[PDB]
């Protein structure tokens, strides 16, 4: 209902008011009534990095390493008006002993793009295990030979090409890996223009009908911001209306707590107005 021009006026009003932040604060963090059981089974507990960030049973990724478990969710953002779905797999920064499962997901679905929205360590703590090798070095995870063929960077992110080799069959798979390093946990990007640049890079790398694997440390805060922003941009180019609270709810229905702080939400809303006004 209503238009792009109209939703954007509505969004601006709500930022100025500000009712958008109130409604965000009132939005549920977990979808009422969705079971979270497998993630808390005894054999699975230590495969979670955070005790409070767990996948729903219904949307959790099933390992075709088979009847195993991983802290990862399917997250599909439908833009019905454009007949469009942007598939994601949203996951935590792997643990030393869950690395093998992380590469199993990438291999089972032949994901070609990985987006990592965290540094490995932050403020005295480990936020993610380094599951890829620093060249020249090479590493093995659960029957996968991983080598980093290429490294380049901007001020905000590192772009890496990786080669994944099945050690049984000798089959090879290539993956693009993007690590945004200028975006602290529980916060906003250090630079908004780099962020928008980055998100457009991600969209241009996206393969249709193939999920993009997106993670940060917990896989809900900064990933949620990124999924909202990519959704908004697909809508803007198609002159379709944008309702960021509907976008966040639809994410939260598939993985709990996406877009963690009010500051993150306020940030992505302002970026959405920014992109719209500069393309007008």
């Amino acid at each position: 209902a209503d238009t792009l021009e109209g939703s954007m006026a509505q969004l601006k009003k709500g930022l100025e008011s500000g009712t958008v932040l109130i409604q965000f604060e009132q939005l549920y963090r977990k979808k009422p009534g969705l079971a979270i059981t497998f993630a808390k089974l005894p054999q699975n507990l230590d495969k979670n990095r955070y005790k409070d960030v767990l996948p729903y049973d219904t949307t959790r990724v099933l390992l075709q390493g088979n009847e195993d478990y991983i802290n990862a969710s399917y997250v599909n953002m439908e833009i019905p008006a454009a007949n469009l779905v942007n598939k994601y797999i949203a996951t935590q920064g792997p643990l030393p002993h869950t690395c093998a499962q992380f590469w199993q997901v990438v291999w089972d679905q032949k994901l070609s793009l990985i987006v990592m929205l965290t540094t490995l360590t932050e403020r005295g703590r480990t936020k993610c295990h380094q599951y890829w090798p620093d060249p020249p070095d090479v590493m093995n995870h659960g029957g996968f030979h991983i080598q980093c063929q290429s490294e380049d960077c901007t001020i905000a992110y590192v772009s890496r090409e990786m080669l994944v080799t099945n050690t049984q069959t000798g089959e090879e798979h290539t993956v693009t890996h993007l690590q945004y390093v200028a975006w602290p946990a529980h916060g906003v990007p250090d630079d908004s223009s780099d962020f928008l640049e980055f998100v457009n890079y991600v969209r241009s790398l996206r393969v249709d009908s193939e999920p993009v694997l997106v993670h940060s440390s917990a896989g809900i805060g900064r990933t949620g911001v990124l999924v909202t922003m990519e959704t908004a941009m697909c809508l803007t180019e198609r002159n379709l209306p944008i309702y960021p609270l509907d976008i966040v709810r639809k994410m939260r229905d598939q993985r709990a707590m996406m877009v963690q702080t009010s500051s993150q939400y306020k940030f992505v809303c302002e970026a959405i107005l920014r992109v719209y006004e500069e393309g007008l």
């Binding site: 979670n48 990095r49 955070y50 005790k51 409070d52 960030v53 703590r125 529980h186 440390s217 917990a218 809900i220 805060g221 963690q260 702080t261 009010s262 500051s263």
Partner: peptide, 8 residues
């Protein structure tokens, strides 16, 4: 495990 839930 530390908790990832914060305030702000």
């Amino acid at each position: 495990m530390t908790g990832y839930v914060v305030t702000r």
